[PDB]
């Protein structure tokens, strides 16, 4: 897969109720792409959470290369595997979210 987006960091750990913000990095060579944030489910399925251009939000950053993929008010069951994907599907590598129990 040539020039896929990256997604950082590899692991984000927060307590339930907190926000978590990943960064999808993608410099298109092609013009007109869409950038999707996805969740991987048990048997390797994907589900789409948000997109460029709900608790899940994508924002392009001022450098244009970068995109915050934000979760607001994380729940426990938000824990899991996430990635980003560009369409000029070129998939980023996977990262993880873990949402801890607030005692």
């Amino acid at each position, epitope marked *: 897969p040539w020039n896929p987006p990256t997604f*950082s*960091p*590899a*692991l*984000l*750990v927060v*307590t339930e109720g907190d926000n978590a*913000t990943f960064t999808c990095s993608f410099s298109n060579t092609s013009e007109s792409f869409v950038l999707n944030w996805y969740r991987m489910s048990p048997s390797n399925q994907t589900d789409k959470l948000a997109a460029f251009p709900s608790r899940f939000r994508v924002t392009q950053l001022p450098n244009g290369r970068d995109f915050h993929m934000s979760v607001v008010r994380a729940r*426990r069951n938000d*824990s899991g595997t996430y990635l980003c994907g560009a369409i000029s599907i070129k998939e980023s590598l*996977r990262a*993880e979210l*873990r949402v*801890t*129990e*607030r*005692r």
Partner: antibody
Amino acid sequence: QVQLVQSGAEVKKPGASVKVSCKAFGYTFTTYPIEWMRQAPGKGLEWIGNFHPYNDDTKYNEKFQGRVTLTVDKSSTTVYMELSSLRSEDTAVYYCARENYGSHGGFVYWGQGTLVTVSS
Amino acid sequence: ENQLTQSPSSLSASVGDRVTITCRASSSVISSYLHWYQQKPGKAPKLLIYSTSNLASGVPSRFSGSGSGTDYTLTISSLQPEDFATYYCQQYNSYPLTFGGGTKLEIKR
């Protein structure tokens, strides 16, 4: 080829300060948080806190709320554990460690430990 | 904090025997977030089992883990001489992270 390299052992008087380093080899420094722990001689493991070089977020255990500062220097891919106002009780091997993909909170890679002895 | 309590703190058994170590959590833990370490003297702990029952990379299959809720166990089916060590459980369900007090495995004679 991941390895965490820690600073050498330190003998300290009560009231002094230690700064232990944890330098990361063999991966993108910002991808994983660094966890700090300690284990007094023949005891058991106690969590201190963590630093995520991604976003400079820290989590501390209430025990060490104030007395420990975790800081970073990304240039050198090092996280530092500074412990102030040392007690005899802080005599321990201090470990840094990190997770890997899908360890769900298991620590895959550990520093070699830094023995910090506090005594009058 | 969610205190972890291991039983017993020292156990005795022979090369070739089986042993079972217990880790009881003071509150219930999602099983994905409970893990086991082995520590030989002088050396750092090493991950053995993650998420209750999965062997870590390069861990022999004489090692296995089980349990849920508050009650987890670790089983070595076929003690080798290299396996006399201390074993620790750990939880990543809540902050603060907690570790059990340790079970030290000794050579019956």
